[PDB]
Amino acid sequence: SGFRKMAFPSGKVEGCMVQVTCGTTTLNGLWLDDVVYCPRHVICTSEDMLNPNYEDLLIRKSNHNFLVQAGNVQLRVIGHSMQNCVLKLKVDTANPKTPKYKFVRIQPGQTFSVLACYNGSPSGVYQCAMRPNFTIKGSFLNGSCGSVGFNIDYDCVSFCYMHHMELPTGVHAGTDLEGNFYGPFVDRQTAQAAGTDTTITVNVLAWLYAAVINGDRWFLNRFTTTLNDFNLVAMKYNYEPLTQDHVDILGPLSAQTGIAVLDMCASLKELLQNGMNGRTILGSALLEDEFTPFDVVRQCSGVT
Amino acid sequence: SGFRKMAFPSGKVEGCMVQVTCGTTTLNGLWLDDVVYCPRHVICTSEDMLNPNYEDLLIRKSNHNFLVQAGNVQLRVIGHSMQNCVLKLKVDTANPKTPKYKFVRIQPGQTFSVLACYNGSPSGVYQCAMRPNFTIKGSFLNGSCGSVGFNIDYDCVSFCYMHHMELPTGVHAGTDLEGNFYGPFVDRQTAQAAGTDTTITVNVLAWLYAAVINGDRWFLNRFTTTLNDFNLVAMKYNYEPLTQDHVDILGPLSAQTGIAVLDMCASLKELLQNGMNGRTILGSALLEDEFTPFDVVRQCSGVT
């Protein structure tokens, strides 16, 4: 029993972290096979970030200008290319610690672990979700760029995020491992505001099921609702609309607990309208939305 | 910017996890050098746990009864001994992945990361604190015993916890790596209730400093207090008494923010008396106490 904001074991990813320096800018790179992936803004100075022409800045850079260090040893760069907002540095040595991997582009509401790094060295690991406005609420300082987000299924690491920037509002933006930003963000220091940070309804319901499984049941009520009725309430509270796909995805948790999805929706509707009244659920005084239904099943079943 | 419940990178510890089976009981062991450490209740059946005589149960066990598997390969057990509530299985092979390590016995209020394991395989990593009643609020299922808690300072892993049991109340108890339980708990399935789970005052203040550093400042007020006045309020709310040692430990955060420790105590006193009024601090609607002052500085400075 017990329910925690759990991150994937980071070992497979730590073995891929390297330091990339170009000129006076140092950030993190991801070394997989004989390629090192890093944010293309490694070629910029802080002045360049206001209005960078990446293609023009890249012309003044050669293979020997990209310094890649894995631990205390230098990697030889034998090629470089820009793919969207990432640079791919071909090195002469395949990473011997390369795990089985995939590059995936996640959808909002999906969760992943982040291995925060500085100078190619890991500092910490935490769990987060891709918000509905395509930002992440991470913990990143200057030098953290190139730190990655990932999921692990048994032995395969699915890389989904690479860190690029912090918006003036304190939230974070980045790309998938193909260099495409999540959302409308650009790697330019300009006025970029995030849209509404709505709550991931399907995740709140998943976490309510986790609470029931773990003994916190005070919020369970005598009511039911319909998807359309629940959705009117969800709209009022800036919660994402719940779809029949979401209901289907909650099926296994509904089967385990014996609590129909629409009954749990009615419990959630009451919590939204009446609040928690000074009470807590799984040690939180607010409705948690960074656990997917898959995460709840995984944590409550002990998948390694 | 941003402040997250961050765990240490788990790689160094993943390389130490092994599976230990004795009879029909399988749990996790920690392989460091040529010794595998595991809970002594690996020798028990579920029936034995009601009233175990560990010394008597151990007499019926030989080296060949302890099956130790590291990944897919079997380790040869050439000696075994009981040290307090842990077994030390001497194996014929030193773990090649043994990091630099220390065994430390932590004090309540201190935090650490837990690498939850099943069948010698890591499933997740999360951060937690040793509660003032010597329990931990973890996420552990059956088979998780022998999973360990640790801190990492650059390259040295300080192991502080090994998981042994879940109390009937859903909280967790375990030992240091010398086999001594934290608190008064015993490895017996009996009526063991935990004492008052008081709030770690020094950690709440540390987290309030983290909030100020990260931009959440609404709770800062025009007041100050004294240690004795603050402590009267802390007693009323089941918060640990704040000592001059705690004030001293908060010195660096007080210096960074320019907010005197006693002024922050007055802000905390107001939050205790008046509540949050539906507001949040660092994404939480309650006062967080599982970040030490050291953790706040480490996260806000980017220590790898």
Ligand SMILES: CN(C)c1ccc(N(Cc2ccn[nH]2)C(=O)Cn2nnc3ccccc32)cc1
């Ligand atoms: C290449 N250089 C010197 C550089 C310098 C600065 C940035 N920026 C500014 C920026 C680019 C676009 N919009 N905003 C960043 O936001 C990078 N970054 N990422 N997470 C951070 C957390 C704290 C502090 C800085 C952080 C990128 C690149």
Ligand SMILES: CN(C)c1ccc(N(Cc2ccn[nH]2)C(=O)Cn2nnc3ccccc32)cc1
């Ligand atoms: C050796 N065997 C079969 C055994 C079997 C059961 C236990 N116990 C019971 C117990 C011993 C003392 N007080 N309570 C445990 O609490 C072990 N354990 N630890 N975390 C758990 C999380 C969920 C479920 C079980 C969990 C220990 C040992």
